[PDB]
A paper describes a structure:
Within ICPs, several dsRNA segments interact with each TEC and these interactions stabilize segments, enabling improved visualization of their major and minor grooves as observed in other RNA viruses. Five major dsRNA segments are observed adjacent to each TEC and are labeled based on their positions relative to the TEC, with a 6th segment observed adjacent to the template entrance in polar vertices. VP3 dimers (containing conformers VP3A and VP3B) encircle each 5-fold vertex; with VP3A conformers seated around the 5-fold vertex center, creating pores adjacent to each transcriptional enzymatic complex’s (TEC’s) template exit channel for direct transcript capping and release via VP1 turret proteins (TPs). Absent conspicuous VP3 rearrangement, the internal volume of the ICP increased from 5.51 × 107 Å3 to 6.02 × 107 Å3, or about 9.3% relative to the grass carp reovirus (GCRV) virion and ISVP with which [name] (GSRV) shares 96%–100% a.a. sequence identity. By reducing the packaging density and thus viscosity of the genome, the enlarged ICP provides the rigid dsRNA segments greater freedom of movement and presumably reduces the energy required to initiate transcription. The VP2 RNA-dependent RNA polymerase (RdRp) is organized into the N-terminal domain (NTD), C-terminal bracelet (CTB), and RdRp core which is further differentiated into the thumb, fingers, and palm subdomains. Our RdRp structure reveals several local architectural changes within these RdRp channels when compared to the ISVP. Viewed down the template entry channel, a positively charged finger domain loop extends into the template entry channel in the ICP, widening to accommodate nucleic acids. From within the channel, the priming loop—thought to separate template and transcript strands—shifts away from the transcript exit channel and orients the catalytically important serine residues towards the would-be incoming template. This migration away from the CTB widens the mRNA exit channel, likely promoting exit through the adjacent I5 pores and turrets.
Residue numbers in the entry:
A (entry chain N): 77 to 106
B (entry chain G): 176 to 472
C (entry chain G): 770 to 1017
D (entry chain G): 1067 to 1213
E (entry chain n): 2 to 412
F (entry chain F): 1018 to 1066
G (entry chain F): 869 to 967
Write the structure that this text describes.
C-alpha cells in the first residue's frame, strides 16, 4: 500500500478551525 | 510548643506565591455585544449577515450596539488566577457593587454609590485590577497553518480553546458580503500576525524566549512586563548563590557548581538589606514587647 | 553595643516608633515620650553558670573544623533561608502601596503624586484611613496567598495617616542614635501610578463619566445622543441670568 | 422643568452612569425614569445616572417624536465600540464604525514594532514577549552533598 | 572596597536654575522612599511595554536624565560639607536616606544655585564613617557624573585583559544565555548598588567582560563566525525593531587574545541614544564596573564640551590619559553589516537591504525626538530630553577609529 | 471575495483588487486562493451569472 | 535533497520541481518529510532499528552537511566534516523529477 502518516495535532487543529461551509442557503441566489 | 516549633523549623512553606503563568491572551478588556441585532426574515432581507450561517465565529462582536468593558483575565487560559478579579457589567446595568469597597457597607443603600468617597473606592478598584494582572506571559507551542489564509508566519494554536484562536487573530477572518465589520477588517495588513522572532539556543529545544504580536492591550502588557522585571531584580547567578551559601557556613562545607549551559533558569530568592531591615522592624512591631514574647526567641 | 563600665554610655532604653513624631507636634520631645520601649529579663542562677565554667571538657583529640563540618551539614539543604527574603520583598511592596493609598486620600501627605486628585474624597478621618489600610493589607494577603501578620500592628495606635517606622536607643549620658528605616524603591507603586494616569483618560471604560448633567425638556423627533452632545452646553455657570441655589 | 419653563444644571464632577436603550419607532417619555431616579436620592448617597438612547436602525424609519430630559456636558462616549456591526450600513441611528486609532498595529501602514500611546489611549493589538523560565531547586543548582 | 569618589554636577543649558519641577521630584523620588537604586524601577525589556512615547518623560532616557538634574540640587555636602535645602525640600538625616520638606523650627541653610560643581567624598567625613550604609550613593553619583561630562550620549569605559576568562565568569555567563540586555543591565546595577564590594570580585570581572563582548558584537567583529570564548550578542532584525540584543553562546571559532591589554572610553556622538534602549543599558552596565573600581585613568579632554575641559580628578590632557572614542549608530550599523558579509554570514544583496532598513528605522527615532523637543522646550523649566541640533544626527564622529579598536581588541 | 449588496434595486457588485466595487457582468480573473475562501458566495452570485 | 527542495532557501541542490507551489517548510514541517523518507527506505530495504530517526526526532531537520567537532581549553577547535560519497539513487531521482 501507499504510505501516509497523520499530521501533528496542532496542524490539524488550525486547519479544522477554518472550514467555511461550501453551500449556504440564502433567499437571494439568482 | 507552637512558638518553639515555629522558631526552630523554617521549612514551614508559607512563602509568597510568586510564580503564576498565563498561556491565554494578555488582555483585560472584552469586546461585548450589548444589544443584539434583530433577525429579519420577511422584510428587509439581506440587510444583516451573521457569521453563524457560515459556521464561523466572528472575530468581533456583531450586535446592534457593541461596548468595551473591563473584565480581568477573561481570556486567561492556563494556571489558576490570583483569586481576586474585576468584572464590570455592561453599562446597561448597575455596576455599583464594584465601588463599595469602603465607606459604604452600613451607610448607603444597596442600589446607590457614595459620591463623597468616590476617589478612595476608585483607587482600591484599580489596585485590585493591578494585582489581578500580575502574571507571567508564558510561551506556548507555535505552528504554521497549511490553509489558504496563511501569511507565511507561524501562529499560536490554542488547542482545546478554538474560540480563543478565532479571537486572537482578527486578520485571519473570512469576509463575505461587506458588512461594517468587513469594511474595517478588510484593511488589515497581511503579515501582522504570529511569531516575529525567537531565541533558539539548543537544537530541538523549546525557544527560551519568543516575540510575537496578537490581540493584547497595552496596559496589561505594561503591568506584566514590570512584574517580570521585578522578578529578575531578585535573581542572581549560580556562582553568586554558591558563594553566598559558602560564606554563610563560615567557609565550611565549601561546595561548588557544575559548568554547562543553563538556558532559562530563574531563582527569585534574594532581596536588599533595606528590605531585610524593614521586615525585621515590622516583625518586631507585630509581636508583643514583654518578657513573655522574647522567651521563645 | 556592649558597653563596659562606662557610666555615661550605659544604655537605658531600646525603642521603636510606629509613627513619625514630626507630623504631630513632637519634634523636640524626650525620646522615651515618642518611641515605645522594650522590657524583658531572664533571671539566671549563678550556681549553674559556675559549674559550667569549671566543668567544661571535650574529646581528647578534637578537630573543630571537622566536627562542625559534620554538625552543620543538614542545615543548608533547602530554600528555607530564602523564603524570608521573598516575604521581605512582598512586605516592602505592600508597605509602600498602603502608604501611597492613604496619602492620596488625604488632602496632602508624604509627598506622592496625586493623579486622581480631581475626584471627590470628603471623609479624611483616621477611621477612613484605617479602613483603607485594612483593605489594602487584605488585598495583598489574598493576591500573594499569605497567612501570617502582614503590615499589621501599624494601626496599633489607630491612626495610619502618620505611620512611619524608626528605631533608637538611649544612653545615660543623654546620647541618642535615632536610626531611620525608609522603604526601598518599589516596582508596583510606580505601575499603580501609571494605571491611575491611564484611568483619568479612559474612565468611560469603567462606566464612569465626568462633567455636569443637564435637564432640559426636548421634544426631539430625529437622532438623539445624550452622551455626545454636538451643540455647546447652554447657560454655563456664571452666564447671564443663571442663578445658583442656596446652600440650604 | 416638565413644563419647559426651567433649565437645571446639576453639578457633580464624576459619577456612575446607566444606559437604557429604546426603540425609536414608538412613543416614549423619559420622565418616569428620572422621577424614579429622584425617588432614591438620600443624604447618604445617590443611584447611578440613567440615560436613554435609541437603537440604531438599518433602514430609513418613521420615528415617533419623543421627549428627553437628561444629557451630559462633555463627550463621555469612549466606551462605544461599533453599531450595526453585522449590517451593510446604519441608516437612521448614530453611525459608529470601528475607529482605527485603537488598532494601529493592525491597519496602520506606518506602524513600528515597539510603539504605543499608553498614557493617553489604549491600543488593543500589539506585540509582546513570552518566556519559558524554569525554576530549579537549590540542589538543582549545586552539588548538595557534604563538603 | 573603595573609600572615595569624585563627581561633577550637571550643566545648565543657559537656563538659570536646575531643570525639574516639583512633580518630577514628587513622582521620581517621593513617598519618603530611598531614591538610591531606582534607575531600573522604570525600565523593561523593550520600548513597546513602556510609556516613553508621549506625555511627560517621552523618551527612554528621559527619567534618568531628570534624576541626574534632580541630584545636582542636593549633593552640596560633597561640595561644601553641609546639607542644604532647595525650594523647601532637604534630606531627612545626615545619612541622606531620603528627602522631605524642611522642618519649621530649625531649617538648614538654603542652597546657593550653581552648575558643574566638582564633588569630593572627603568633604563630608560622615560618609566614610557610615560607608557600609551610604554605599549606594557612590554608584549613582558616579553615573550622574559619567552622564554630566558629555553632551549627546553618556561616557563609559571599556577594557580587555591579555588573559583568558576565568572559570567563574564562564559559569556565570553560561547561566545568562537567553537573557536580553536590559535584564542583564539591571543585575549589574543591582549588584554594585546595594553594598560595598571589592574590585577583586568575580562579578566585577564578569560585568567587565560583558561590556567588552557587547561592544565587540556591536561593531560586528564578534559574530556566529567569530566569538569570544564562545560568547557573543545577537541583534534583532532592523526590519521590525533593531533595538534589542540577547546573549548567545556558540561553537564558532574563538578569537585570540590581544597582543597587549586594550582599553578606552566610549560614548554615542548622536542624539539617537536618548531613545534607544540598547545604548542606555550598555552604558549603565559598563558604568557600573567603573563605579565599584573607580576610574582607571583621566579622560582625554580633546573631544568634550567646554565645561568638561580640565575637570579635577576626571579629565586631563597629560601623559596618563586614556582617549575617548565615539560613534554614530547608522555608520556603525553599516560597518557591522559589512563585517557580516566579509565573514560570509550574509550576501551582498542582503547587506544593502539591511542598510536601507536600519536607516529607515533610525529616521523614525530622529523624527520622533526632534518633534518631541519642540513639544518640551527647555525654557519651560524642566528638561525631559537633552537639547540638540538637526545636524547632530548626521555626525559620523570617530566611528572609523571605533571599529579599528574592536579590530585590535578581538584579534 | 466580498460582494456588496446594495439597496433600492441596484444589482450587486464585486470588490476589485483595487478596493473598488465593480459590476459582476464582464470578465474576471480569480486567483486560486480567493476562490478557496469565498466559494460560498461565488456559488450564489458569480456562478449563476 | 528532499527537504532542501521544499524550503526555497536551503542547502544547494538542483531544483527541477520549483515550478510547483509549496509553502516554505518550518522546522516542524521538515520533520514529517524526514520521517516519510525514513519510513520509505526502511520499508523498501526491510530494515529494523533506527536508520535516520535522530534527524527527525531531535534538532532541526533542515540539514546541510554533517560535522562533528571537539573544543580544547586552549580555544582551538578541531572540526571534522563528513561529506557523503557519490550517491547513485540521488542521481536517478533527480532525473525522474526532471522528466
Amino acid at each position: 500500500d501507499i504510505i501516509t502518516r497523520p499530521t501533528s495535532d496542532s496542524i490539524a487543529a488550525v486547519a479544522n478551525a477554518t472550514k467555511p461551509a461550501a453551500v449556504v442557503s440564502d433567499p437571494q441566489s439568482m | 510548643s507552637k512558638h518553639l516549633s515555629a522558631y526552630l523549623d523554617s521549612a514551614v512553606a508559607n512563602g509568597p506565591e510568586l510564580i503564576v503563568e498565563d498561556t491565554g491572551l494578555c488582555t483585560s478588556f472584552m469586546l461585548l455585544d450589548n444589544i443584539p441585532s434583530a433577525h429579519l426574515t420577511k422584510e428587509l432581507i439581506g440587510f444583516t449577515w451573521f457569521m453563524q450561517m457560515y459556521q464561523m465565529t466572528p472575530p468581533l462582536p456583531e450586535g446592534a450596539v457593541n461596548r468595551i468593558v473591563c473584565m480581568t483575565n477573561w481570556a486567561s487560559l492556563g494556571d489558576e488566577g490570583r483569586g481576586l478579579e474585576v468584572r464590570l457589567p455592561p453599562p446597561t446595568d448597575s455596576s455599583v457593587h464594584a465601588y463599595k469597597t469602603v465607606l459604604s457597607r452600613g451607610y448607603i443603600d444597596n442600589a446607590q454609590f457614595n459620591p463623597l468617597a468616590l476617589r478612595s473606592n476608585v483607587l482600591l478598584m484599580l489596585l485590585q485590577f493591578t494585582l489581578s494582572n500580575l502574571k507571567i506571559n508564558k510561551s506556548s507551542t507555535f505552528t504554521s497553518d497549511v490553509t489558504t489564509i496563511t501569511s507565511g508566519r507561524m501562529i499560536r494554536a490554542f488547542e482545546g480553546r478554538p474560540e480563543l484562536l478565532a479571537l486572537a487573530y482578527p486578520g485571519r477572518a473570512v469576509l463575505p458580503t461587506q458588512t461594517k465589520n468587513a469594511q474595517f477588517l478588510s484593511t488589515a495588513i497581511a503579515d501582522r500576525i504570529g511569531r516575529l522572532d525567537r531565541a533558539n539556543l539548543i537544537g530541538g529545544e523549546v525557544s527560551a524566549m519568543v516575540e510575537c504580536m496578537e490581540l493584547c492591550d497595552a496596559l496589561t502588557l505594561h503591568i506584566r512586563e514590570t512584574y517580570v522585571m521585578l522578578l529578575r531584580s531578585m535573581h542572581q547567578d549560580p556562582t553568586q548563590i554558591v558563594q553566598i551559601v559558602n560564606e554563610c557556613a563560615n567557609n565550611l562545607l565549601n561546595s561548588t557548581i557544575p559548568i554547562s549551559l543553563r538556558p532559562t533558569i530563574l531563582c527569585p530568592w534574594f532581596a536588599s538589606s533595606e528590605d531585610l531591615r524593614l521586615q525585621q522592624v515590622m516583625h518586631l512591631v507585630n509581636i508583643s514587647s514583654n518578657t513573655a514574647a522574647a522567651l521563645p526567641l | 553595643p556592649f558597653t563596659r563600665l562606662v557610666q555615661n554610655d550605659v544604655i537605658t532604653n531600646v525603642l521603636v516608633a510606629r509613627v513619625d513624631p514630626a507630623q504631630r507636634g513632637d519634634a523636640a520631645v524626650d525620646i522615651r515620650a515618642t518611641h515605645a520601649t522594650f522590657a524583658a529579663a531572664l533571671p539566671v542562677d549563678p550556681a549553674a553558670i559556675v559549674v559550667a565554667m569549671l566543668c567544661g571538657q571535650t574529646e581528647t583529640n578534637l578537630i573543630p573544623s571537622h566536627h562542625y563540618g559534620k554538625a552543620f551539614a543538614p542545615l543548608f539543604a533547602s530554600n528555607a533561608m530564602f523564603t524570608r527574603n521573598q516575604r521581605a520583598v512582598i512586605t516592602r511592596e505592600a508597605f509602600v502601596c498602603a502608604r501611597s493609598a492613604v496619602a492620596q486620600c488625604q488632602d496632602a501627605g508624604f509627598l506622592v503624586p496625586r493623579p486622581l486628585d480631581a475626584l471627590r474624597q470628603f471623609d479624611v478621618t483616621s477611621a477612613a484611613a484605617a479602613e483603607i489600610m485594612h483593605a489594602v493589607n487584605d488585598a495583598f494577603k489574598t493576591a500573594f496567598d499569605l497567612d501570617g501578620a502582614l503590615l499589621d500592628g501599624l494601626a496599633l495606635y489607630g491612626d495610619p495617616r502618620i505611620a512611619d517606622l524608626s528605631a533608637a536607643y538611649l544612653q545615660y549620658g543623654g546620647n541618642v542614635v535615632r536610626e531611620h528605616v525608609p522603604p526601598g524603591p518599589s516596582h508596583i507603586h510606580r505601575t499603580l501610578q501609571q494605571v491611575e494616569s491611564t484611568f483619568m483618560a479612559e474612565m468611560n471604560l469603567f462606566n464612569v463619566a465626568r462633567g455636569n448633567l443637564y435637564l432640559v425638556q426636548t421634544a426631539t423627533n430625529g437622532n438623539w445622543s445624550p452622551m455626545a452632545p454636538v451643540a455647546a452646553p447652554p447657560f454655563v455657570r456664571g452666564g447671564p441670568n443663571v442663578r445658583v441655589v442656596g446652600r440650604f | 422643568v416638565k413644563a419647559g419653563r426651567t433649565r437645571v444644571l446639576v453639578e457633580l464632577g464624576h459619577y456612575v452612569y446607566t444606559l437604557h436603550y429604546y426603540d425609536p419607532q414608538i412613543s416614549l417619555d423619559e420622565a418616569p425614569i428620572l422621577e424614579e431616579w429622584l425617588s432614591k436620592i438620600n443624604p447618604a448617597g445617590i443611584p447611578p445616572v440613567p440615560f436613554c438612547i435609541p437603537i440604531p436602525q438599518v433602514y430609513p424609519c418613521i420615528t415617533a417624536r419623543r421627549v428627553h430630559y437628561a444629557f451630559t456636558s462633555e463627550n463621555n462616549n469612549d466606551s462605544l465600540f461599533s453599531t450595526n456591526a453585522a449590517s451593510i450600513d446604519t441608516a437612521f441611528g448614530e453611525n459608529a464604525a470601528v475607529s482605527p486609532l485603537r488598532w494601529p498595529g493592525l491597519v496602520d501602514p506606518n506602524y513600528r514594532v515597539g510603539t504605543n500611546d499608553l498614557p493617553n489611549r489604549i491600543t488593543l493589538y500589539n506585540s509582546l514577549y513570552r518566556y519559558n523560565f524554569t525554576y530549579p531547586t537549590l540542589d538543582g543548582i549545586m552539588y548538595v552533598r557534604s563538603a | 572596597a573603595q573609600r572615595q569618589f569624585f563627581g561633577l554636577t550637571y550643566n545648565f543649558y543657559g537656563q538659570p536654575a536646575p531643570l525639574f519641577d516639583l512633580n518630577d521630584l514628587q513622582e521620581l523620588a517621593g513617598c519618603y522612599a530611598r531614591p538610591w537604586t531606582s534607575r531600573f524601577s522604570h525600565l523593561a525589556i523593550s520600548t513597546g511595554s513602556l510609556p516613553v512615547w508621549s506625555a511627560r518623560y517621552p523618551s527612554v532616557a528621559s527619567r534618568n536624565i531628570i534624576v541626574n538634574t534632580l541630584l545636582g540640587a542636593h549633593l552640596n555636602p560633597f561640595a561644601g560639607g553641609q546639607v542644604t535645602s532647595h525650594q523647601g525640600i532637604t534630606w531627612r538625616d545626615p545619612v541622606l536616606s531620603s528627602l522631605a520638606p524642611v522642618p519649621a523650627i530649625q531649617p538648614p541653610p538654603v542652597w546657593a544655585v550653581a552648575e558643574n560643581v566638582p564633588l569630593d567624598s572627603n568633604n563630608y567625613p560622615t560618609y566614610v564613617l557610615n560607608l557600609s550604609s551610604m554605599w549606594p550613593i557612590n554608584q549613582d553619583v558616579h553615573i550622574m557624573t559619567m552622564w554630566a561630562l558629555s553632551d549627546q550620549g553618556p561616557i563609559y569605559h571599556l577594557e580587555v585583559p591579555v588573559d583568558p576568562m576565568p572559570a567563574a565568569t564562564t559559569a556565570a555567563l553560561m547561566a545568562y544565555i537567553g537573557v536580553p540586555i536590559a535584564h542583564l543591565a539591571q543585575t549589574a546595577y543591582r549588584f554594585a548598588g546595594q553594598l560595598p564590594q571589592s574590585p577583586d570580585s568575580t562579578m566585577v570581572s564578569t560585568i567587565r567582560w560583558l561590556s567588552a563582548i557587547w561592544f565587540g558584537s556591536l561593531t560586528g567583529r564578534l559574530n556566529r563566525s567569530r566569538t569570544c570564548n564562545g560568547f557573543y550578542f545577537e541583534f534583532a532584525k532592523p526590519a521590525l525593531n533593531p533595538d534589542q540584543a540577547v546573549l548567545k553562546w556558540n561553537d564558532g571559532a574563538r578569537a585570540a587574545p590581544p597582543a597587549a591589554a586594550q582599553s578606552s572610553y566610549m560614548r554615542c556622538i548622536s542624539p539617537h541614544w536618548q531613545h534607544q534602549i540598547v545604548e542606555v543599558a550598555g552604558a549603565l552596565m559598563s558604568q557600573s564596573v567603573t563605579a565599584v573600581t573607580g576610574l582607571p585613568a583621566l579622560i582625554d579632554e580633546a573631544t568634550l564640551p567646554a565645561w568638561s575641559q580640565g575637570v579635577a580628578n576626571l579629565t586631563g590632557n597629560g601623559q596618563g590619559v586614556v582617549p575617548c572614542l565615539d560613534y554614530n549608530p547608522v555608520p556603525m550599523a553599516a560597518a557591522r553589516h559589512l563585517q557580516w558579509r566579509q565573514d560570509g554570514l550574509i550576501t551582498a544583496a542582503q547587506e544593502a537591504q539591511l542598510n536601507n532598513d536600519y536607516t529607515a528605522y533610525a529616521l523614525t527615532i530622529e523624527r520622533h525626538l526632534t518633534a518631541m523637543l519642540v513639544a518640551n522646550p527647555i525654557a519651560a523649566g524642566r528638561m525631559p530630553i537633552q537639547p540638540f541640533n538637526a545636524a547632530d544626527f548626521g555626525q559620523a564622529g570617530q566611528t572609523a577609529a571605533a571599529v579599528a579598536l574592536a579590530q585590535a581588541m578581538f584579534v | 471575495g466580498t460582494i456588496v449588496p446594495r439597496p433600492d434595486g441596484l444589482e450587486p457588485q464585486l470588490i476589485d483588487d483595487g478596493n473598488v466595487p465593480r459590476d459582476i457582468a464582464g470578465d474576471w480573473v480569480y486567483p486560486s486562493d480567493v476562490l478557496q475562501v469565498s466559494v460560498a458566495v461565488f456559488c450564489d452570485y458569480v456562478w449563476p451569472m
